[PDB]
Paper text:
The Bacillus subtilis efflux pump BmrA, belongs to the type-IV family of MDR ABC transporters, conferring resistance to cervimycin-C secreted by the biotope competitor Streptomyces tendæ13. Type IV ABC transporters involved in MultiDrug Resistance (MDR) phenotype perform their function by undergoing a series of conformational changes pertaining to the alternating access mechanism. They are formed of two transmembrane domains (TMD) forming a cavity at their center where substrates bind, and of two nucleotide-binding domains (NBD) binding and hydrolyzing ATP-Mg2+ to fuel the system. Binding of ATP-Mg2+ to the NBDs bring them together, translating this conformational change to the TMDs which then open towards the outside (Outward-Facing, OF) where substrates are released.
CryoEM grids were frozen at key ligand concentrations and imaged; without ATP-Mg2+ in absence or presence of R6G (named E504Aapo and E504AR6G), at a 1:1 molar ratio ATP-Mg2+:BmrA dimer (E504Aapo-25µMATP and E504AR6G-25µMATP), at the K0.5 or close to the Kd-app for ATP-Mg2+ (E504Aapo-100µMATP and E504AR6G-70µMATP), and at saturating concentrations of ATP-Mg2+ (E504Aapo-5mMATP and E504AR6G-5mMATP). Clear electron densities could be observed for R6G in all the IF and OF reconstructions where it was added. Here again, electron density denotes multiple positions adopted by the molecule (also observed in MD simulations below), in line with the ability of BmrA to recognize structurally-unrelated ligands. R6G binding in E504AR6G and E504AR6G-25µMATP results in a further rearrangement of TM helices within the dimer, with a wider opening of TM4-5-6’. Surprisingly, the rearrangement does not occur within a half-transporter, as it overlays well with BmrA in absence of R6G, but in the relative orientation of the two halves (right part of the structure on which the overlay is performed). The effect of R6G binding further translates all the way to the NBD, resulting in a reorientation of the 2 NBD that face each other more directly, hinting at an influence on ATP binding observed in Fig. 1. The first NBD rotation centered on V363 is conserved in E504AR6G, while the rotation centered on E453 is reduced by more than half. Notably, the oscillation that bring the NBDs closer together is greatly affected as the E504AR6G structure is stiffened and movements are very reduced (less than 1 Å). However, the conformational space explored by E504AR6G is much more focused compared to E504Aapo in which the NBDs explore a larger space, hinting at the allosteric influence of R6G on the NBDs.
Residue numbers in the entry:
A (entry chain A), B (entry chain B): 10 to 581
Write the structure that this text describes.
């Protein structure tokens, strides 16, 4: 069950799989030749001892084996590179699916966290696929072969005591656990004392007023004395362990080395044998813990793998957006409409409205954000849970999500910017038309970007790594230029009367209206200052609509009932 | 030399000198004995080796020296215990004066920092005194003696190559540095890629509106391909270093072991000499990093010492207060009051006020540099600098703060239940009389204390762990009970009345005012339903009282500009 989804998504980066069949095999010989490296080492060492100034043939074969082992270690670069290619392909597919995935996923699952999950969970899978698989294979092969060559290397002479040495060292483990437990006790008491002081200290005011200094100091003294009387036991245990570990670690070593010297070395063990023995020890003890590291990394990477496959299993926007082409220029009306994050838990309910072409329209409702979902519905972002959008025969579903979107267009208010790419930032949402110079006509039709025409002279200047350093007016001018360059004129603007103290807004108001005059557009606002200009208003409630009429009757009934009271709170 | 300032606070508690001398003498004994241990190990090993029936005397001497070394390592407990004692003394003195410090220390130096210093700067001094001093001494002694006995035990032959091997590690080290640098490059590129696409993604709204996600995928592709093309260089350089470092290590080990083999095979170096050699090798290689850790920990801890000695300065607050006793039931005046943290940094300008002996008095005005600081200045938390508090011939400025606080009571809006049982919470300010079963006798009339006065346990209630077992609004009743038990005289209450909706405030106010029927009180009462019972008011304009008079006509005169509308707004 573990490896099935893992391979199911790894196979997506298919074409390099055969390469693995090389590298893994190139790994295996790397291990197997490794298994024989100490042996030749022996044949080299005793080669000097038995035959001083040894012959050329054994030297040549030793050299060719060494270069073979080194070149195989280099060829492990092939494994690492294949892993890197797999990771890059996986992450590229992940990014593609994430970008073209429904925005519906984003607002509910902490996109500022999935952003880091991509990189972290890809790095863990990288670590699984690059060195941990080879690590486990080489570890099992190394331990088995090393133990076998050890058996061959002595008639059950020093391996038995060698293996018994950890059996004797088992005595060390309970004392280490006792150390860990009492150290945790010290940490807990330190935390308790720190918490006691942190709690009792800001009350210095009260305790001083009460003139109860002595009781305060007594509580502190009790705490500190408790800490001291626990640290004393810490010291006792440490003093007892010190010799009890150092002596055993020295005794095991002296026992093994003395038994090797006196007995075995007298009759059987050559120096070239002992060097290969040490090499085998250093080659067996080193990779052994790597199997446990492999197991835990494999578990974690399997979890990351489930996360990734969950991410990829969510694609729907592609076939949805590739639909009938349109030409827009039709008034927009909503019949009974409902919406919610869940099919039966609804944020919007039983709402309907009408918006004639050319007439500017605005939306006002509760400050909690109820109007937001309706706005997103008007610009056809979330598919309506229930209801229909009035058009000619209401075909709103069959239209492409690029086409209708690009004819209707979009602009925003609440500080979207990009850093040091001003002209390309203008060209950001453009259809593929480079428009090298003619965009100047847009730059002058902005009616406010003219004031900032010095920046087009630099044409690229950077204001900050995150872009926000350019003031809100600059971004508003850039946005209105974008809107001009997108379509002749169709617009919706967000959060018009929710910030900027109405001042800079008005400074760019002069820029926008004279360009959007006599054109269908929708505006989101919380205050009446700009919406009462010439605009048809829609009064919204908690997931409900009641306001109908253009300005005056809607005011005199609902504003007199609701909107006047709330807008009087925003006078200051 | 900084050691004299360090010992100046170290010697502030001084029972440790004799135990220090004993412990360090035992420590140097441990060092010398451990230095001579490997010779005894050699003698024991050789006696087991050269003779099959090693005499009981040699083994007995080995055992007795082993027991001596173990017992001396045990005696290092004396050093550790002495260190714990000196730490406890240091921390106890630090607390004893810290709790005595003026409030002006705490309102400027924060609460959490101080306690963090108390724990961490003490722990580092413990690490300095307990282990690291002995560590450095034993390290230098061990390295010198081990090198000497390496010179003498074996000829220069083995030692020269043994030391040249680290000189051969000059081949290893720069490539490790190259690894570290390129790995840091990989980390930086990962951070850059994460930051770029983290900036990109939340604009999903705008880009999907612009349906230009193709450019987005292009940017993602460029970034991801850059990361891949740097990771490939990472992998290449890693695969180059691997075999090189492995080969150098194998060569060093094979060279040293082979040379030893010819030595044994040829003659000076005996097996016991070899085990002594190995033991010395480990014994010298352990503390070489320990001395560096000593140096860095000492460098860190000197700053701790400076912080500690900085703490041990300002004991004046509760030392200057042992002056004079008084009855203190007289009306009070304030003259020429213009105060602040520093003469340059003024928080108040020249003001004067009068408060009577039997009626209610409150202070009202803006928060910023207003009511609050004058309230603290009246409660003697901040010492007088240029103004006078008149209780006669300015006697309060010369009277004891103990007496003044004995004749005063303090209750607060925050009302935090201090740690401990409700018994000590109620009798906190009056430890001088035990009041076993008469604490409650004067608390019944409290119209809101009765809500908890039926408590069956009636004493077992405590803070728990954060003070939530009884409500903060209930802690108001506990505090008023404390006040009625303690103070038969003048009282102050702190209350940001434009907070907590005041719904329960009257529910407790109805009690506190009634039980203070004839006691002078000063309160923060800027809200409407609290100035009503305030009688005389003190109106702050900006760090200044611009009017002194009775409740109603005073707000009538002061609301000609601001008070009326502001207070009608506050009640919302
Ligand atoms: C037998 C060969 N193996 C060892 C021999 C050792 O001898 C040591 C002698 C010393 N001089 C005598 C005072 C001191 C100061 C520390 C020693 C340490 C040591 C150093 C730092 C931290 C812990 C220890 C440690 O584990 O020591 C055990 C008490 C040590 C460690 C090992 C592995
Ligand atoms: C083919 C299986 N995979 C490996 C096999 C390895 O074999 C090694 C043998 C050695 N001697 C025998 C001649 C030495 C000295 C280092 C070795 C390293 C090694 C090299 C540099 C840094 C750390 C290590 C390392 O693994 O040490 C971890 C403690 C090593 C590393 C890997 C991945």
């Amino acid at each position: 069950s573990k490896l099935k989804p893992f391979f199911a998504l790894v196979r997506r980066t298919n074409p390099s799989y055969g390469k693995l069949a090389f590298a893994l095999a190139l790994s295996v010989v790397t291990t197997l030749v490794s298994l024989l490296i100490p042996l030749l080492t022996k044949q080299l060492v005793d080669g000097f001892s038995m035959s001083n100034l040894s012959g050329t043939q054994i030297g040549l074969i030793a050299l060719v084996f060494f270069v073979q082992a080194g070149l195989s270690a280099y060829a492990t670069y092939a494994l690492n590179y294949n892993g890197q290619k797999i990771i890059s392909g996986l992450r590229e597919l992940l990014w593609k699916k994430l970008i073209k995935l429904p925005v519906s996923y984003f607002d509910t699952n902490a996109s500022g966290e999935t952003v880091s999950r991509v990189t972290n969970d890809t790095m863990v899978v990288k670590e699984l696929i690059t060195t941990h698989i080879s690590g486990f294979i080489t570890g099992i092969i190394s331990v088995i072969g090393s133990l076998t060559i050890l058996f061959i290397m002595n008639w059950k002479l020093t391996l038995l005591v060698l293996v018994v040495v950890p059996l004797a060292a088992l005595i060390l483990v309970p004392i280490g656990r006792k150390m860990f437990s009492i150290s945790r006790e010290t940490q807990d008491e330190t935390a308790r004392f720190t918490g006691l002081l942190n709690q009792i200290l800001p009350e210095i005011r009260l305790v001083k007023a009460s003139n109860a200094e002595d009781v305060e100091y007594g509580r502190g003294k009790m705490g500190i004395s408790s800490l001291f009387k626990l640290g004393v036991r810490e010291a006792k245990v440490q003093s007892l362990v010190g010799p009890l570990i150092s002596l055993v670690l020295m005794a095991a070593l002296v026992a093994v080395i003395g038994y090797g010297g006196m007995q075995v070395s007298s009759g059987e063990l050559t120096a070239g044998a002992l060097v290969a023995f040490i090499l085998y020890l250093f080659q067996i003890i080193m990779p052994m813990g790597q199997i446990t590291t492999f197991f835990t990394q494999l578990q974690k990477s399997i979890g990351a793998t489930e996360r990734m496959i969950e991410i990829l299993a969510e694609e729907e926007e592609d076939t949805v957006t590739g639909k009938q082409i349109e030409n827009a220029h039709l008034p927009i009306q909503l019949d009974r409409v409902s919406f919610g994050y869940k099919p039966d838990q609804l944020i919007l309910k039983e709402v309907s409205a009408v918006i004639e072409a050319g007439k500017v329209t605005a939306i006002v409702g509760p400050s909690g954000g109820g109007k937001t979902t309706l706005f997103k519905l008007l610009e056809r972002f979330y598919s309506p849970t229930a209801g229909t959008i009035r058009l000619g025969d209401e075909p709103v579903d069959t239209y492409s999500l690029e086409s209708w979107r690009e004819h209707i267009g979009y602009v925003s208010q609440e500080s979207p910017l990009m850093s040091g790419t001003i002209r390309e930032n203008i060209c950001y949402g453009l259809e593929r038309d480079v428009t090298d110079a003619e965009i100047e006509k847009a730059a002058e039709m902005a009616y406010a970007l003219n004031f900032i025409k010095e920046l087009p002279n630099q044409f690229d200047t950077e204001v900050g790594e995150r872009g926000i350093m350019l003031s809100g007016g600059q971004r508003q001018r850039i946005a209105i230029a974008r809107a001009l360059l997108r379509n002749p004129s169709i617009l919706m603007l967000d959060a018009a009367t929710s910030s900027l103290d109405s001042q800079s807004e008005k400074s760019v108001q002069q820029a926008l209206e004279v360009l959007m005059e006599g054109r269908t557009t929708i505006v989101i606002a919380h205050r009446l200052s700009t919406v009462v200009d010439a605009d048809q208003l829609l009064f919204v409630e908690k997931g409900e609509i009641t306001g109908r009429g253009t300005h005056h009757e809607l005011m005199a009934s609902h504003g007199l009932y609701r909107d006047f009271a709330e807008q009087q709170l925003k006078m200051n």
